[PDB]
Ligand binder design. Structure first.
Ligand SMILES: */C=C/C(=O)N1CCN(c2c(C#N)c(=O)n(-c3c(C)ccnc3C(C)C)c3nc(-c4c(N)c(Cl)cc(Cl)c4F)c(Cl)cc23)CC1
Ligand SMILES: Nc1nc2c(ncn2[C@@H]2O[C@H](COP(=O)(O)OP(=O)(O)O)[C@@H](O)[C@H]2O)c(=O)[nH]1
Ligand SMILES: [Mg+2]
Length: 169
């Protein structure tokens, strides 16, 4: 059977979790994707010559119980921690998302990529160096993305798969 990777995309409301997921899977940019909709999305990809299923939970942080969210938190093998480069609060939240992931896995060593999204915008209040330094502190990759232009989008998800593959070896 083809290897499957359950991935979880987390981060503050409005940072582009849905736009990144839909750009990765469907190759189009969404501007009005319901902020409250949480679902899993799948795509068969080839990463470094090995075919795998990306099985991605696009989180929406709503209260209602979900057997699916529990399954992806319990068995998910990697997290995308997304902030927006024009949203200081979303960057300040990253510490809290990483603490949530550590508690879920009871581990400091969970495969994780820091994603600075909306890098097409000029209004940059979180600089590259700040995010690079935080990712270095956490021992994780930092990828700059635009769900709008596609820059970094495959790189963010493929880098997370490479972190899982390195973790499992
Ligand atoms: C436009 C709506 C939207 O995108 N979101 C996503 C982010 N949301 C959210 C919020 C908020 N506000 C939140 O406070 N937490 C959270 C909770 C419930 C407890 C403790 N800390 C936090 C954050 C400050 C980190 C959210 N937590 C989670 C969450 C994560 N990230 C993980 Cl790894 C596991 C579990 Cl069981 C979680 F519940 C998520 Cl998905 C979203 C949170 C609000 C609406
Ligand atoms: N300019 C720009 N806008 C974006 C980008 N990613 C998301 N957006 C917009 O930001 C808003 C929130 O995005 P969404 O993906 O729904 O946020 P979510 O709450 O994290 O799922 C929408 O209007 C998106 O079109 C990006 O890379 N660049
Ligand atoms: Mg969304």
């Amino acid at each position: 059977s083809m290897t499957e990777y359950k991935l979880v995309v987390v981060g503050a409301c409005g940072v582009g979790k849905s736009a990144l997921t839909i750009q990765l899977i469907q190759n189009h940019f969404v501007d009005e994707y319901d902020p409250t909709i949480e679902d899993s999305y799948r795509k068969q990809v080839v990463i470094d010559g090995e075919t795998c299923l990306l099985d991605i939970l696009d989180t929406a942080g709503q209260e209602e119980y979900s057997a699916m969210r529990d399954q992806y938190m319990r068995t998910g093998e990697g997290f995308l921690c997304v902030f927006a480069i024009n949203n200081t609060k979303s960057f300040e939240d990253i510490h809290h998302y990483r603490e949530q992931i550590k508690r879920v896995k009871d581990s400091e060593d969970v495969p994780m990529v820091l994603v600075g999204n909306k890098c097409d915008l000029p209004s940059r209040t979180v600089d590259t160096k700040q995010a690079q330094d935080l990712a270095r502190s956490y021992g994780i990759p930092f990828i700059e993305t635009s769900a709008k232009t596609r820059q970094g989008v495959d790189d963010a998800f493929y880098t997370l798969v490479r972190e899982i593959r390195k973790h499992k070896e």
